Amino acid sequence: VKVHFDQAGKKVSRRNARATRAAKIAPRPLDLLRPVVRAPTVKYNRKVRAGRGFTLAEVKAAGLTAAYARTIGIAVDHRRQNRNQEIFDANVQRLKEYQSKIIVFPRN
Amino acid sequence: KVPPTIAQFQYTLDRNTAAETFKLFNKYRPETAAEKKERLTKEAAAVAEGSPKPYAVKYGLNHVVALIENKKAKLVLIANDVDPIELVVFLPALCKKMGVPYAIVKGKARLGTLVNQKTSAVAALTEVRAEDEAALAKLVSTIDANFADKYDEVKKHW
Amino acid sequence: MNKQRTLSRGVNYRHRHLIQDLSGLLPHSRKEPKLDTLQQLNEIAELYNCNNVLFFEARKHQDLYLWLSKPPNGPTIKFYIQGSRPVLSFDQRFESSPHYQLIKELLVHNFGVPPNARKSKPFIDHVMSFSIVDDKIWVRTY
Amino acid sequence: KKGAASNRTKFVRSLVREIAGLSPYERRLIDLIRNSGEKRARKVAKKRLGSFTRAKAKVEEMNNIIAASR
Amino acid sequence: PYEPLIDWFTRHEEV
Amino acid sequence: GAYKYLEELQRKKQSDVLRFLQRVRVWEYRQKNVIHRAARPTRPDKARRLGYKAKQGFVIYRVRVRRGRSLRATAEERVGRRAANLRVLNSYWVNQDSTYKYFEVILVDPQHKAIRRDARYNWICDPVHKHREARGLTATGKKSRGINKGHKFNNTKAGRRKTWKRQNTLSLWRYRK
RNA sequence: GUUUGACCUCAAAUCAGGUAGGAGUACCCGCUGAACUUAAGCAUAUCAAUAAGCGGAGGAAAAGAAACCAACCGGGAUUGCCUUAGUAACGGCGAGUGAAGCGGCAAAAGCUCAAAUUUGAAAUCUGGUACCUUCGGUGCCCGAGUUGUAAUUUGGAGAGGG
RNA sequence: AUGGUGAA
């Protein structure tokens, strides 16, 4: 039988690891931007949730190369295609706001 | 007995024609490692203190096959004792379809001696100087009658 | 005198045993490997001089459809149905409208083994209770 | 994407067809085609192959080879 | 079983 | 490249041309020992696409097993047992016999400096890959284990033995539901 | 030419440069693998795809970037938990057996080959020797390699040119 | 039942 006695210990360890990761990842928020997307189903069609990463079309619309986008923490999807125009527009607006919000140190 | 595609070998360039081909090929020995190294060192020394493409035979199997199907190669040599026979079964038919003349020569070891390599299994020439262009053309013309016309029934002899 | 000939991926023991002895009960129908989709199946009869052909379809991972139609220009219908000479029963409902009258006429040479076929036996051994009772097309045989 | 013809590959396959001759089962199939009809040839191929579409494609290939032979 | 090969394809030289 | 021609020829394994080669090679193997080191692969095109490099350290071995567990996995295990220091990467069928079957397995020497200093293949030197054939991690082994994407392998997609404990184990949280 | 040389195959060396046996074994990756025991019964159902038996690794292992899941206005690596759900589904439909998408959370790095001729220069690498600033740096030699070492590249394409 | 021991 398995008992999750380590629940509190596991949570503490996860928090400690997350805090430690900030030591090497202090300048950036330790996470990649997740696009807003619609879950595939009939029941949950009305609901909207985050996705893995922006499509190639969205990245191109945002005005930056896919390779550069990854280095700035922008997630890119290998096979995610864009079908809904409204979702693409929302993702483009989010990317534009993000880019306007970034401060990037020079390659000293 | 062997299939019709096999036994297409064992019919190869004769001693006289093979000797002539080797003599012509011996005039285009590619620069060896030592020769290239010494030439490059001399060039660097001249540069520190302050010519057209080098014609040579083509022998790499991949390079030779790439030259074939493009009509660039003017002559091709095929080794008959290739252990993986599958590597060479299609070369004669492919050359015939492309119309590129070829001559089979006995001995992969003998073939490799002309390129300073133990074995190459293939050899071909594309570029040729004017002094040797006529000789190459004459050899190609002679090879036609020597081989293609003498073995028009090669499909037989299972 | 009377002569006639006739003909999805992945099935476990139950589906394999479902259509198990239909070939032995309908010798005029051959047993051949499955072929997924449909029009080309109509031309298979040419290779066997057959005048009737049956083709299968699979849908929803749970339903199996048995199509019946004459190859050249025959009508087609389907339903989700769950060596001795047979004898076929009938029902009065099969002669009320064309939708069943035509099926009844087709069955006579689409299901009944010809009396003079290659494997047609002389003697009968079982009876079929073919009927459309309760609007269904599933019947029990003994 | 789709399997483009890739003319180079088509030529290579055509050359390999002549280089490899015909398999003994292929030899039997062509012999029956020339003497027993495509109707029986297709059935023989299906018995010696899987789906009927593959047998039909093989029979068409044999017919094309025979036509090109003369 | 034992018949000569055919040059149906190699007959025509590539252009 | 000529490798396309070799692949096309290998497609027509049933061609009468290849039958003579098959007979000659199977006879030679029958005259030869059951297991021996091959000077060079008989199917370089097949070996190259499987990740074979002509550089030093890529040893090729020939293994013969009785016809009638997967034969390829058994042959890989046998060659690994014999060639303990070598690491089994992949194998390909080259010939068959009425009673015997022949598979060619390509091996890489982890201790060879040519592989240790090569980033493209130094990963094999990791201790986790020791006796990779014994764990069924090869192409034949992975297929034999039913490890593939999709719900068609839900019984063994992530490992039947591993998933059995997960699905047949009682889990109780601190705050019982 | 009755000699001689190129190779290819395999041996010989208490020759140099190298690795494996075993132990441990809770967990991991595979093979073989039963019975007491149960519904009223043992071939499916169930102890059990278990213990024992055999082979190989690490501090975690396997798996991991789809020939995936779905049918919606679509999601877009693998893995663990809750839920989906004791549901779909299986079983003298009973006794009993027993899944998965979607949703939420933990963490999200994706990559490298075969398949196109460098051909206007095997330019690649191991080993030996001689030096240094020694988990390595360089002159020279041999060997490996042309049956392929060197520019990108795994479809989000890519390459030759302007 | 599985794994083992030695012997008129």
Hunting for tokens 């199946």 — which residue is that? C41
Instruction: Say if the Cβ atoms of D22 and F16 lie within 8 Å.
Output: yes
Distance G79 C1' – F159 CA (angstroms): 13
Beta strands in F39-98 (DSSP E): 58-66, 87-96
Domain containing F62 equals 1-177
Q: Which nucleotide is nearest to B41 (CA to C1')?
A: G139
How many Cα atoms within 13 Å fall on the side-chain side of residue F141? 18
Instruction: Say if the Cβ atoms of B83 and F5 lie within 8 Å.
Output: no
Resolution (A): 4.4
Q: Which amino acid is at B70?
A: N
Q: Which nucleotide is nearest to F46 (CA to C1')?
A: G114
CB distance C85 to C113 below 8 Å? yes
Nucleotides of G under 7 A from a protein CB: 5-10, 17-21, 27-32, 49-50, 55-58, 61-83, 91, 98-104, 106-127, 136, 140-150, 155-157
- Structure tokens belonging to residue C17: 């045993």
- D5 to chain B, closest Cα gap in Å: 18
Range 1-20, chain A: CB under 7 Å to any strand G atom: 14, 18
Q: Which chains touch E (3 or more CB pairs under 8 A)?
A: B, D
Q: Which residues of chain A does F169 touch, with a Cβ-Cβ cutoff of 8 Å?
A: 1-2
Which method was it determined by?
Answer: cryo-EM
Cα F127 from Cα B79, distance rounded (Å): 44
- Structure tokens belonging to residue D11: 């030529």
Residues in chain A, total = 108
Q: Is the C-beta of residue A43 closer than 7 Å to nucleic acid chain G?
A: yes
For the domain that residue F94 is a member of, what is the CATH number? 3.40.1120.10
Q: Which residues of chain E does D16 touch, with a Cβ-Cβ cutoff of 8 Å?
A: none
- Structure tokens belonging to residue B124: 């071909």
CB pairs under 8 A between C and D: 15
Range 102-141, chain F: CB under 7 Å to any strand G atom: 111-114, 117-118, 120, 127-131, 134-137
- C111 to chain D, closest Cα gap in Å: 24
Beta strands in chain C (DSSP E): 53-59, 63-69, 85-88, 124-128
**Distances from the Cα of B82 to the Cαs of B105, F11, F25, in angstroms?**
11, 21, 14
CB pairs under 8 A between B and D: 15
Cα D44 from Cα D37, distance rounded (Å): 11
- Structure tokens belonging to residue C55: 């083709």
Domain containing B24 equals 1-158
Q: Can you spell out the DSSP letters for chain A?
A: -EE-TTHHHHHHHHHHHHHHHHHHS-SS-SS-B--EEE-SSSTTTT-EEE-S-B-HHHHHHHTS-HHHHHHTTB-B-SS-----HHHHHHHHHHHHHHHHH-------
Instruction: Say if the Cβ atoms of F2 and B65 lie within 8 Å.
Output: yes
CB distance F161 to F135 below 8 Å? no
Beta bridge pairs of residue B105: B79
What's the DSSP call for residue B147?
I
D29, D30, D36, D37 alpha-carbon torsion, rounded to 10°: 100
CB distance D48 to F38 below 8 Å? no
The minimal CB distance from B4 to the residues E4, E12, E13 is found for E4
Q: Whose CA is nearest the C1' atom of nucleotide G28?
A: F162
- Structure tokens belonging to residue B15: 């001693």
Q: Which amino acid is at B82?
A: V
D57, D58, D63, D64 alpha-carbon torsion, rounded to 10°: 70
**Distances from the Cα of C2 to the Cαs of C13, C112, F130, in angstroms?**
36, 11, 73
CB distance B147 to B13 below 8 Å? yes
Q: Does E contact B via 3+ CB–CB distances below 8 Å?
A: yes
Q: Which chains touch C (3 or more CB pairs under 8 A)?
A: D
Which residues 6+ apart lie within 8 Å of C116 measured at CB? C1, C2, C3
How many Cα atoms within 13 Å fall on the side-chain side of residue E10? 21
Domain count of chain F?
1
- Sequence-separated contacts (24+) of B110-116 with Cβ below 8 Å: B111/B77, B111/B79, B114/B22, B114/B25, B114/B26, B114/B29, B114/B57, B114/B59, B115/B29, B115/B30, B115/B57, B115/B59, B116/B29, B116/B30, B116/B32
Topology classification of domain D1-70: Arc Repressor Mutant, subunit A (1.10.10)
Q: Which nucleotide is nearest to A41 (CA to C1')?
A: G72
B117 touches F at CB < 8 Å: no
* CA B89 distance to own-chain centroid: 16
- Structure tokens belonging to residue A91: 């993702």
B88, B94, B95, B99 alpha-carbon torsion, rounded to 10°: 170
CB distance B56 to B129 below 8 Å? no
Domain count of chain B?
1
Q: Which nucleotide is nearest to B55 (CA to C1')?
A: G120
Residues within 8 A of D (CB atoms), E 1-15 only:
1, 5-10
